[PDB]
Design a protein around this ligand. Structure first.
Ligand SMILES: [Cl-]
Ligand SMILES: [Cl-]
Ligand SMILES: [Cl-]
Ligand SMILES: [Cl-]
Ligand SMILES: [Cl-]
Ligand SMILES: [Cl-]
Ligand SMILES: [Cl-]
Ligand SMILES: [Cl-]
Ligand SMILES: [Cl-]
Ligand SMILES: [Cl-]
Ligand SMILES: [Cl-]
Ligand SMILES: [Cl-]
Ligand SMILES: [Zn+2]
Ligand SMILES: [Zn+2]
Lengths: 309, 303
């Protein structure tokens, strides 16, 4: 019935296979070659560190793409596993009680991220054939540009945060992204250029889960930052002003986007292709979050020393 | 240096060689494209290669300023000796003319914001990105408290007796769809600069300054903005372009001219802009055609 529709794609090279067994055989063959890096990295990051038997891997691959069943829930679970799991992202660990350097590293690399964000959302506006998707993304772009009804845009709030931390706007804007922000931006741009608007929507809005304060309810071992920062006299008001935005908005915002992603993925019968691309966006986001931290290292040598202690 | 064919985009060693090519292809049964281009831009009557070479060279090089060239070509095309039938009907518009405008333009405005969004994604120029985001934001939220152009259009239709539900459920006419497809394909396949010129050049339709450069008619009788003859919602919608598009089209074309010089693409942008004029002429004819379907007495007034 779903015999030919249920034929699995390689999550690394995107080749199609007749069964989970054929995919497992392929992945095992390519990963056990000197030349390949991509397939072994994918298996290490998502399945296991130790080498599995083809049938063992076939069952592991099937369980990984079918559980959780809900795409919205699958995206949420994989995001937590990757960034808020047993080994949370080093940027998130540093973000718990951030130094001036952590926060400036955030400002400097995120200014570039926000420029790419509004451009990639604009490609969705152009390529989508769904009015609810177009309305949603135009609201998003408008709020990233002029802000919400007189309030400043997230971009302006970020620049104001940097200025409050002692870095003039002129210096922030003239600072080129670090290589991993560039690499991440290139990946997201190529997703927006070559993939479906639905894949692009899932790839970008899944990242908003980083500031979703509900994540701890689903297994996140840490918040994005210590919520005490939003009330203590320890940080400038501009820091509180910027961080409070994601703190009140992204729980309902990421939820609404992923709800639409789940709906159209069912209609267009593209669950695995969307799952593959979201994982690829997760690899870009981790690199980009590293760039934020490494920018912090440039400003604060003690921050590098602490992370590697 | 080699002129490009404005129809098939092939390159030629001289204006004489392009004129020879165009004359050869236009004087074949199979071709429609080359003869229609010559009819719409140069002349109705056949020319010998030499007079066509001079006519082509003059058409593409005069005015020298791209901004002035887009403006001059636009006026000749839509506000010349034979102004567009929609513009003639728009002088003192009936309920049918205005509803035809509302019905087909809602689809135009949806395409507009999507095509401008492709420019935001594809441009590498910050002033272009800033300009287009301000445009999209204004088409979505409105300017200085006021409702967006799109909301004002729907309100105009509602004031003319057509409920919003009926306006929104009306599919575009085949010619609106055809024109939208042309603009979408320009946005997909051409450079962001070509796409910017192709779309913002259309804003010249509501540029109230055009009569200063020789337009034979305004977009509509400016008296409409003050008379008690039309509902306030009509005045509210038409007031926007009247007020804004003179400075808006100017600012866009100024940027188009700047980046066209930097990227040395004058003729390519000129070609694509004229392909956009063809799509716009089709789309304006669609507004009028919708007006016929709604107002039986309208066809006699045009014929
Ligand atoms: Cl589930
Ligand atoms: Cl790279
Ligand atoms: Cl698509
Ligand atoms: Cl303060
Ligand atoms: Cl230090
Ligand atoms: Cl001149
Ligand atoms: Cl620039
Ligand atoms: Cl067509
Ligand atoms: Cl381009
Ligand atoms: Cl009234
Ligand atoms: Cl040039
Ligand atoms: Cl009638
Ligand atoms: Zn593979
Ligand atoms: Zn030709």
């Amino acid at each position: 019935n779903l015999y030919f529709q249920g034929m699995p794609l390689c999550p690394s090279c995107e080749m199609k296979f007749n069964s989970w067994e054929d995919l497992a055989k392929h992945m095992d063959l390519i990963a056990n070659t000197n030349s390949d890096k991509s397939h072994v990295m994918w298996l290490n990051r998502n399945i296991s560190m130790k080498r599995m038997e083809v049938n063992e891997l076939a069952n592991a691959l099937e369980r990984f793409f079918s559980t959780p069943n809900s795409l919205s829930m699958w995206i949420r679970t994989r995001f937590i596993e990757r960034f808020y799991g047993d080994n949370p992202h080093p940027f998130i660990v540093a973000m718990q009680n951030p130094t001036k350097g952590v926060l400036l590293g955030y400002v400097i690399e995120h200014q570039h991220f926000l420029k790419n964000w509004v451009k990639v959302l604009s490609s969705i506006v152009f390529k989508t054939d769904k009015d609810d998707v177009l309305q949603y993304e135009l609201e998003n772009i408008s709020v990233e540009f002029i802000g919400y009804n007189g309030r400043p845009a997230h971009y302006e709030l970020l620049l104001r945060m940097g200025e409050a931390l002692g870095m003039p706007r002129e210096k922030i804007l003239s600072t080129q992204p670090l290589p991993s922000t560039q690499s991440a931006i290139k990946t997201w741009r190529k997703i927006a250029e070559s993939k479906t608007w639905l894949e692009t929507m899932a790839s970008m809005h899944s990242l908003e889960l980083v500031a979703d304060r509900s994540l701890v309810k689903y297994g996140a071992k840490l918040p994005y930052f210590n919520p005490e920062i939003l009330s203590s006299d320890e940080y400038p008001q501009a820091v509180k002003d910027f961080l409070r935005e994601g703190y009140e908005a992204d729980v309902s915002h990421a939820g609404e986007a992923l709800e639409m992603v789940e709906k159209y993925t069912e209609e267009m019968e593209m669950k695995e292709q969307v799952q593959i691309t979201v994982l690829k966006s997760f690899d870009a986001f981790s690199k980009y979050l590293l760039a934020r931290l490494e920018r912090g290292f440039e400003i604060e040598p003690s921050l590098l020393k602490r992370v590697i202690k």
